[PDB]
């Protein structure tokens, strides 16, 4: 049609809020301000308590929360079947889910366990494939799926180890989904976020060193936050990004472009 | 109070490279207009000025500000931007939609390309962005956003693109080096890689209809794109929606870049 | 001194199954350059074929070891045993991949969790564990090479789950290169163009892809197992010193065009 | 009888861009010499001819064939290659090790770059390969291999590379478009992306010792590369060992391209 960022009459599933620092919460704040109906997903019960507390910050009249552990085909198939009944058809999904064992992230990459490797692949990459298959059922008119990645999918970064191979997998997942679901007018894209202080990120060594290197070396000489990812998520989830699919947008102050 | 906003009132954007209603830059203009931006326009030929004045009737621009700039001339570019600074004041960004090569060099085997045809393509299609950026910077002391238009032929050897492929590769590196230079001045530099669109430049190149049909057949979205889709992405990149994005190349091409 | 004389060099070659195997192309080439070759196989059908094929080579002593890369034990034990039988090695050529035909025909979005993680296990993780063990036999340094396809870099029709496995493999190579670089171990990939092999025979319209290469690729021709072998020789020898984390396309220039 | 062979007897290679003993192209020459190849050399300045004659004593080249070619001149390039065709006959490939930009443009902020400095860098550092390829093709009716030398700054914005980064991006696209054009004539075109090396061109740029130290600290192999390592990879790419490889860019840089 034309260029509009008015997301009234739009419904978006947002997977992977855990606390106020979660990137997916940044996405939620932004989509909320633009007047979208938001469905939320969580794994742990601690995340449900946090979500209910955080909905007070939003202008969401009715809370729709669904527990989905992406490790379970059943929790994913049932979760999306249930969303279809409770809220009906949706316009897109924001995927903000990743995990690896701290054991495998400290080790030399060559020491990585078969279990730690396939675990990282399962949660951080395959989750997008099954989520896409199910969400498709609620998007007969078309829609937009967005996953969150890191530069470590494209380059060997110190300490990212097994998560780098998971993100490389995720980034190829996005391309293959984009080619598969394109004929159904479903767009699939990734956001490569710069480093952000979150629940997942807190408790890895010298994370403050990486934040300082970005401020020093990145073109914009600053770090990014959850809302900047949110703004780009709005572009990719809305029809502003029509004709964009299989794309990876770096929201990282230009760090990807330098060496 | 809105964090994420596409409200471009109180924003001024220079748009270089409108020639007719089919121009990609016109798609950009229609979109930025609808979002309530003040638009300055640039043209080379007089045919383009006549067309621009006729087309402003389609827009909600109260005052027409047109400036003749041939990007081959340091003086026309330096003077044009000095004049825009006086007439409209400080700007928030520039959309660059300018390219040219001799049809001679685009038909030939790439190895037959003339030194003159090669350096001409570089001058208009790549260096133009460097000098435009240097001058526009003077009108963006608070920061801003520069966007150039490229094609997948900058990244891969495509049949018949020849000398323009090497110009676009040059443009795409230009964007990265400008992004690194002007980043500390809070100026973002990015490119849009547009899929094929029927325009004045594109009409009269061989079997262009073959390329449009291959996109519809092989590209993920099984369809071609238009000037407005480029316009929408231009709005994202020129607005503060794209804050934290610089040195980036967004493919608006129905996913064609992602497949093989 | 620039030399392709591989006397006094020993190379493990994983993934020979028949005479059409890419790894066999690698073996023929390394043999002609006078290298001692250790071989690995999974199925017994592959052992029978290997013994028959060693007659075509100038290998005095046959060293065959059964390793299924799905098993930590078969991989750890296989490489411990190679260390005893032949001693220290100079590199490993990895030519191993697998996915369920089920998942390769389906729309990629239909892919099963089992089919996906299986492809990752054999086609990508195998390189990580192989590298960990082979390192033990390369205290002076060495070269590891894995085989990939352009489908790791771009979505190609019908490659589906194997594309995501190859994307994983190609990142594996980069992360191994960064980890084992300080131990003077180089890790690189060869992106082979399409070749008629046992694995490749019986997948839909493979003859369409071979014809598109001959028509559209810069060299207007397909490649064979030996061309991969020649590039494998470069990457496994010290000719490629200073090259690590690299992906060489042996594909008639197809990767460079669109 | 050897499928895989690095025996370059009965092979003739033109090597453009030796200036002194530290030149990358000299590393290429030493390696190709040891493998028993007939080597033709090219130079611009007379200082380079004196140095070349002195350096031929280090090689096992029976007959010295030196030709002055300034790649800025179509005539010097067309005539030089016509003359090589008469003196030595048909060749098997060309190693291109030629680049230049004004020190003025390499110190400045990239946005300050002059139109003259930009197009000069493009002319010598990129177009030179196109015209050299067109002429050398005439001496390679059976096929052959052309190799150009590039730097990571063609792919990423690196501090201080400025206008040479845009030239190398141009060169790297040149290689792809030449590979597609000359492939049917069985001519392969590839690039080597060398890590940083102490040479005549490189000496006298600021904090070059900082970049060498960052490579030793951060690159996978925790060491820098030299002219011979580039030479070894040049041997692979120029010989038939690299058959089926064209439009490729091999990083000889201790793995630095693969990390971030
Ligand atoms: N923070 C950063 O610097 C960057 C992050 N990213 C990516 O952004 C995404 C989110 O990161 P961030 O916001 O830091 O992470 P958070 O720690 O805030 O959120 C992680 C989320 O993952 C969810 N999760 C983990 N396992 C599962 C599972 N099996 N099923 C469902 N949900 C699960 C968690 O839910 P619960 O805790 O309830 O399981 C949690 O909500 C990730 O994909 C990450 O790779 C990318 C670049 C940078
Ligand atoms: N159409 C397509 O399929 C694609 C186009 N592109 C790129 O999009 C951009 C514009 O193309 P498109 O809109 O189709 O073409 P148009 O024919 O609509 O526009 C070309 C424009 O370039 C201007 N121009 C040319 N030379 C100069 C100069 N020396 N100084 C100032 N202006 C000049 C022309 O002005 P005048 O008429 O006054 O000379 C004209 O307005 C180019 O960068 C092109 O490479 C990228 C991908 C696809
Ligand atoms: N053929 C082609 O066109 C191309 C192939 N490639 C890649 O080249 C490599 C070799 O394939 P190619 O030579 O065609 O196929 P082959 O049929 O020759 O080989 C498949 C090989 O993988 C081995 N293998 C499979 N599973 C396991 C396992 N669990 N443990 C150990 N070995 C295993 C097989 O052994 P067994 O059968 O005895 O189990 C067999 O040797 C693959 O990585 C492939 O993706 C890349 C580009 C093109
Ligand atoms: N050194 C490094 O750190 C790296 C260098 N490279 C590349 O390697 C190549 C050579 O580098 P390096 O060893 O440093 O170079 P050298 O300084 O040793 O040689 C530079 C050469 O360029 C030649 N040249 C310049 N202009 C012309 C012209 N108009 N016509 C003919 N020849 C000309 C010079 O000839 P004369 O002096 O006779 O004018 C000289 O032979 C370049 O392409 C460079 O970009 C790539 C990565 C790293
Ligand atoms: C180079 C780095 C620093 C090392 C970072 C490793 C992070 C990897 C990704 C995941 C998110 C970390 C992870 O698996 C967390 C757990 O091991 C421990 N924490 C938890 O379990 C908490 C309770 C939950 C909520 O976490 C999850 N995921 O469930 C990368 C950084 C520069 C950038 C970065 C941090 C990228 C990224 O997140 O992918
Ligand atoms: C692979 C292709 C197909 C071949 C098309 C090559 C087009 C290259 C673009 C240049 C800019 C065309 C060009 O310079 C045309 C002029 O020589 C003649 N036309 C004019 O002068 C008219 C009057 C004016 C208005 O035109 C200009 N430019 O001033 C590429 C296509 C599939 C995609 C494409 C068309 C890309 C692109 O535009 O860059
Ligand atoms: C686009 C294509 C065409 C579709 C090709 C799919 C091939 C994927 C490769 C995997 C490895 C094939 C595979 O796993 C098939 C098995 O399910 C059954 N085959 C076997 O079991 C045979 C007997 C054994 C030897 O197989 C194995 N692996 O053990 C890709 C092509 C253009 C290029 C190509 C064929 C690339 C590649 O091999 O990866
Ligand atoms: C990131 C960097 C540091 C910035 C320096 C870049 C230098 C690039 C080389 C260019 C070609 C310098 C140049 O144009 C030379 C002249 O301006 C001055 N020198 C000469 O005139 C001598 C006498 C002659 C023989 O040289 C020439 N061109 O003829 C780059 C480094 C990390 C790596 C590097 C320097 C790469 C490279 O060579 O491109």
DSSP-derived secondary structure for C168-187: HHHHHHHHHHHHHGGGTEEE
CB-CB contact of B104 with B113 (8 Å): no
The pairing of strands C10-14 and B38-43 is unpaired
CB-CB contact of C6 with C28 (8 Å): no
CB-CB contact of A90 with A83 (8 Å): yes
The residues with which C64 forms a beta bridge, in sequence order, are C39
* Phi-psi domain of C242 (left: phi exceeds 0; alpha: psi -120 through 50; beta: other): left
Name every residue whose Cβ is closer than 8 Å to that of residue D143 and which is 6 or more positions away in sequence. D185, D186, D187, D188
DSSP state of B256: G
Instruction: Tell me the two tokens of residue B104.
Output: 């001679």
The residues with which D41 forms a beta bridge, in sequence order, are D15, D66
- Substitution target in D110, D150, D211, D260 with the highest count of A β-carbons within 10 Å is D260
Q: Report the alpha-carbon distance of residue D248 to residue C255 in Å, rounded.
A: 8
Q: Report the alpha-carbon distance of residue D182 to residue D180 in Å, rounded.
A: 6
Q: Report the alpha-carbon distance of residue C169 to residue C247 in Å, rounded.
A: 11
Residue C52: Cβ within 10 Å count: 11
Residue B100 alpha carbon to ligand 6 centre in Å: 6
Q: Report the alpha-carbon distance of residue D257 to residue C34 in Å, rounded.
A: 33
Q: Report the alpha-carbon distance of residue B52 to residue B69 in Å, rounded.
A: 14
* Phi then psi dihedrals of residue A61, to 5 deg: -60, -55
The residues with which A19 forms a beta bridge, in sequence order, are none
CB-CB contact of D79 with D68 (8 Å): no
To the question of domain B1-260 being in CATH 3.30.750.24, the answer is no
Measure A28 CA to nearest chain C CA, in Å: 26
Residue A171 alpha carbon to ligand 7 centre in Å: 22
C58 in a known ligand binding site: no
DSSP string, B197-246: ---TTTTTSTTHHHHHHHHHHHSTTSS---HHHHHHHHHHHHSGGGTT--
CB-CB contact of B41 with B67 (8 Å): yes
Helix H, strand E, coil C: the string for B46-114 is HHHHHHHHHHHHHCCCCCCCEEECCCCCHHHHHHHHHHHHHHCCCCCEEEECCCCCCHHHHHCCHHHCC
Q: Report the alpha-carbon distance of residue B2 to residue B28 in Å, rounded.
A: 24
**Domain A1-259: which topology?**
Rossmann fold (3.40.50)
Packed helices D115-122 and B115-122: angle between N→C axes, nearest 10 degrees:
130
Closest CA to B34 of D108, C146, D160, A5: A5
Q: Report the alpha-carbon distance of residue A84 to residue A95 in Å, rounded.
A: 18
If you count residue pairs, one on B and one on C, with CB atoms under 8 Å apart, how many are there? 26
Residue D98 alpha carbon to ligand 4 centre in Å: 4
How open is the CA angle B211-B29-B163, to the nearest 5 degrees? 40
Q: Report the alpha-carbon distance of residue A2 to residue A201 in Å, rounded.
A: 39
CB-CB contact of D233 with D145 (8 Å): no
User: Three-state DSSP class for C190?
Assistant: strand
CB-CB contact of A87 with A64 (8 Å): yes
The residues with which C155 forms a beta bridge, in sequence order, are B259
Q: Pick C170's closest partner by Cβ from A126, A168, A180.
A: A168
Name every residue whose Cβ is closer than 8 Å to that of residue C179 and which is 6 or more positions away in sequence. A108, A109, A110
Strand order in the sheet with D144-150: D66-68, D38-43, D12-16, D93-96, D144-150, D187-194, D249-252
Packed helices B162-182 and B115-122: angle between N→C axes, nearest 10 degrees:
40
Instruction: Tell me the two tokens of residue B158.
Output: 């495509």
Q: Report the alpha-carbon distance of residue C228 to residue A194 in Å, rounded.
A: 38
Instruction: Tell me the two tokens of residue C132.
Output: 């960990």
Catalytic residue from among C65, C125, C159, C234:
C159
C121 in a known ligand binding site: no
Q: Is the dihedral of CA B209, B213, B218, B220 positive or negative?
A: positive
Q: Report the alpha-carbon distance of residue B227 to residue A243 in Å, rounded.
A: 11
The pairing of strands A248-251 and D66-68 is unpaired
- Substitution target in B37, B236, B240 with the highest count of A β-carbons within 10 Å is B236
CB-CB contact of A101 with A114 (8 Å): no
Q: How many residues does chain C have?
A: 258
- Ligand 4: which of D24, D95, D148, D204 to mutate, judged by most atoms within 8 Å of the beta carbon? D24
User: Three-state DSSP class for C257?
Assistant: strand
CB-CB contact of B237 with A230 (8 Å): no
Q: How many residues does chain D have?
A: 260
Determine the number of helices (DSSP H) and then strands (DSSP E) in chain D: 9, 7
CB-CB contact of B98 with B118 (8 Å): no
Given an 8 Å threshold on Cβ–Cβ distance, is A180 in contact with C116? no
Q: Report the alpha-carbon distance of residue D251 to residue D153 in Å, rounded.
A: 12
Determine the number of helices (DSSP H) and then strands (DSSP E) in chain B: 9, 7
Residue D134: Cβ within 10 Å count: 21
Q: Report the alpha-carbon distance of residue B229 to residue A240 in Å, rounded.
A: 7
Alpha carbon separation from D190 to A174, B11, C253, D182, D245 (Å, rounded): 31, 46, 10, 12, 8
Q: Report the alpha-carbon distance of residue D165 to residue D96 in Å, rounded.
A: 17
Given an 8 Å threshold on Cβ–Cβ distance, is B259 in contact with C156? yes
Q: Report the alpha-carbon distance of residue D155 to residue D137 in Å, rounded.
A: 28
Q: Report the alpha-carbon distance of residue B96 to residue B128 in Å, rounded.
A: 9
Q: Is the dihedral of CA A220, A224, A229, A230 positive or negative?
A: negative
Q: List the alpha helices (DSSP H) in chain C.
A: 22-32, 44-54, 72-85, 101-105, 113-120, 126-135, 160-180, 206-216, 225-236
Name every residue whose Cβ is closer than 8 Å to that of residue D231 and which is 6 or more positions away in sequence. C2, D27, D28, D29, D30, D31, D32
CB-CB contact of A42 with A96 (8 Å): no
Question: Measured from the CB, is residue C98 less than 6 Å from ligand 3?
Answer: yes
CB-CB contact of C17 with C46 (8 Å): yes
User: Rounded to a whole number, what is the largest CA-CA distance in chain D?
Assistant: 58
CB-CB contact of B141 with B193 (8 Å): no
DSSP state of A192: E
Residues in contact with ligand 7 by the CB-under-6-Å rule are C 17, 97-101, 104, 149, 156, 158-159, 162, 194, 198-200, 203, 206, 209
Measure B260 CA to nearest chain C CA, in Å: 5
Instruction: Tell me the two tokens of residue D184.
Output: 């049917």
DSSP string, A31-55: HHHTT-EEEEEESSHHHHHHHHHHG
Q: Report the alpha-carbon distance of residue A244 to residue A33 in Å, rounded.
A: 24
Q: Report the alpha-carbon distance of residue B34 to residue A4 in Å, rounded.
A: 9
Packed helices D128-137 and D74-87: angle between N→C axes, nearest 10 degrees:
30
Q: Report the alpha-carbon distance of residue D74 to residue C253 in Å, rounded.
A: 29
Q: Report the alpha-carbon distance of residue B171 to residue A249 in Å, rounded.
A: 19
What is the structure's resolution, reported in angstroms to one decimal? 2.5
Instruction: Tell me the two tokens of residue C251.
Output: 């594909």
Residue D208 alpha carbon to ligand 8 centre in Å: 11
Measure C171 CA to nearest chain A CA, in Å: 5
Given an 8 Å threshold on Cβ–Cβ distance, is C218 in contact with B157? yes
Q: Report the alpha-carbon distance of residue D173 to residue B162 in Å, rounded.
A: 10
CB-CB contact of D193 with D250 (8 Å): yes
Given an 8 Å threshold on Cβ–Cβ distance, is A169 in contact with C171? yes
Catalytic residue from among D67, D127, D161, D236:
D161
Which residues of A carry out catalysis? 150, 160
CB-CB contact of B109 with B57 (8 Å): no
CA C9 to chain centroid, in Å, comes to 19
Residue A200 alpha carbon to ligand 5 centre in Å: 4
Name every residue whose Cβ is closer than 8 Å to that of residue D65 and which is 6 or more positions away in sequence. D39, D40, D41, D84, D87, D88
| Residue given tokens 């300018």 in the structure block | B98
Q: Report the alpha-carbon distance of residue B175 to residue B155 in Å, rounded.
A: 14
Name every residue whose Cβ is closer than 8 Å to that of residue A224 and which is 6 or more positions away in sequence. A193, A194, A196, A251, A252, A253, B244
Instruction: Tell me the two tokens of residue C249.
Output: 């396309």
Torsion angle of C-alpha atoms A87, A88, A92, A95, degrees rounded to 10: 60
Give the up-direction half-sphere exposure of residue A50: CA atoms within 13 A in the CB hemisphere. Answer: 17
| Residue given tokens 């260096």 in the structure block | B127
How open is the CA angle B46-B47-B53, to the nearest 5 degrees? 90
Measure B117 CA to nearest chain C CA, in Å: 22
DSSP state of D259: B
Name every residue whose Cβ is closer than 8 Å to that of residue C168 and which is 6 or more positions away in sequence. A121, A165, A168, A169, A172, C120, C123, C124, C152
Q: Which residue of D has its CA nearest to C183?
A: D221
CB-CB contact of D222 with C186 (8 Å): no
The residues with which A94 forms a beta bridge, in sequence order, are A14, A146
CB-CB contact of A229 with A25 (8 Å): no
Long-range contacts of residues A201-207, Cβ cutoff 8 Å, at least 24 apart? A202/A21, A203/A102, A204/A105, A204/A159, A205/A159
Query: Residue D149 CA: which ligand is closest?
Result: 4
CB-CB contact of B224 with B43 (8 Å): no
| Residue given tokens 């296990």 in the structure block | C121
Q: Report the alpha-carbon distance of residue D32 to residue C3 in Å, rounded.
A: 11
CB-CB contact of C230 with D160 (8 Å): no
Give the up-direction half-sphere exposure of residue B115: CA atoms within 13 A in the CB hemisphere. Answer: 17
**Determination approach:** X-ray
Closest CA to B91 of B145, B129, B53, B127: B145
Q: Report the alpha-carbon distance of residue D125 to residue D174 in Å, rounded.
A: 10
Alpha carbon separation from C162 to A31, C144, D146 (Å, rounded): 35, 21, 34
Q: Report the alpha-carbon distance of residue B111 to residue B90 in Å, rounded.
A: 45
CB-CB contact of B137 with B182 (8 Å): yes
Q: Domain extents for chain A?
A: 1-259
The residues with which C147 forms a beta bridge, in sequence order, are C190
Torsion angle of C-alpha atoms B99, B105, B109, B110, degrees rounded to 10: -50
CA C238 to chain centroid, in Å, comes to 19
Q: Report the alpha-carbon distance of residue A71 to residue A130 in Å, rounded.
A: 10
Q: Report the alpha-carbon distance of residue A112 to residue A104 in Å, rounded.
A: 5
How open is the CA angle A84-A88-A90, to the nearest 5 degrees? 90
Closest CA to C68 of C102, C41, C34, C106: C41
Q: List the alpha helices (DSSP H) in chain A.
A: 23-33, 45-54, 73-86, 102-106, 114-121, 127-136, 161-181, 207-217, 226-237
DSSP state of A149: E
User: Rounded to a whole number, what is the largest CA-CA distance in chain A?
Assistant: 53
User: Three-state DSSP class for C191?
Assistant: strand
Name every residue whose Cβ is closer than 8 Å to that of residue B54 and which is 6 or more positions away in sequence. none
Closest CA to B14 of B72, B58, B71: B71
Long-range contacts of residues D204-207, Cβ cutoff 8 Å, at least 24 apart? D204/D103, D205/D106, D205/D160, D206/D107, D206/D160
CB-CB contact of B69 with B77 (8 Å): yes
DSSP string, D157-198: B-TTTHHHHHHHHHHHHHHHHHHHHHGGGTEEEEEEEE----
A97 in a known ligand binding site: yes
Judged on CB neighbours under 10 Å (0-12, 13-18, 19+), D139 is buried
DSSP state of A3: -
Tell me if residue D161 is catalytic. yes
DSSP string, D187-205: EEEEEEEE-----TTTTTS
Q: Which residues of B are annotated as a binding site for L-glutamate?
A: 107, 207, 209-210
DSSP string, A74-106: HHHHHHHHHHHHHT---SEEEE------HHHHH
CB-CB contact of B12 with B88 (8 Å): yes
What is the CATH code of the structural domain delimited by C1-258?
3.40.50.720
Residue numbers after which chain C is interrupted (C to N above 2.5 A) read none
End-to-end CA distance of chain B: 45
Instruction: Tell me the two tokens of residue D226.
Output: 């030299």
Catalytic residue from among B13, B95, B161, B236:
B161
């Amino acid at each position: 049609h034309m260029a509009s960022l008015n997301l009234e009459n739009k419904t978006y599933v947002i997977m992977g809020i855990a606390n106020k620092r979660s990137i997916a919460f940044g996405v939620a704040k932004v989509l909320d301000q633009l007047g979208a109906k938001l469905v939320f997903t969580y794994r742990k019960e601690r995340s449900r308590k946090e979500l209910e507390k955080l909905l007070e910050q939003l202008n969401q009249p009715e809370a729709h929360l669904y527990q989905i552990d992406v490790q379970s085909d059943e929790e994913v198939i049932n979760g999306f079947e249930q969303i279809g009944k409770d809220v009906g058809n949706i316009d897109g999904v924001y995927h903000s889910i990743a995990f690896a064992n701290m054991e495998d992230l400290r080790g030399r990459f060559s020491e990585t366990s078969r279990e730690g490797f396939l675990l990282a692949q399962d949660i951080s990459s395959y989750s997008l494939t099954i989520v896409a298959h199910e969400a498709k059922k609620l998007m007969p008119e078309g829609g937009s799926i967005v996953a969150t990645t890191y530069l470590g999918g494209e380059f060997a970064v110190q300490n990212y180890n097994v998560m780098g191979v998971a993100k490389a997998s995720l980034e190829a997942n996005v391309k293959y989904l984009a080619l598969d679901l394109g004929p159904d007018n479903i767009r699939v894209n990734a956001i490569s976020a710069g480093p952000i202080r979150t629940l997942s990120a807190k408790g890895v060594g010298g994370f403050n060193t990486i934040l300082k290197e970005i401020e020093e070396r990145a073109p914009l000489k600053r770090n990014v936050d959850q809302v900047e990812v949110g703004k780009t998520a709005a572009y990719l989830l809305s029809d502003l990004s029509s004709g964009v699919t299989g794309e990876n947008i770096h929201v990282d102050s230009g760090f990807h472009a330098i060496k």
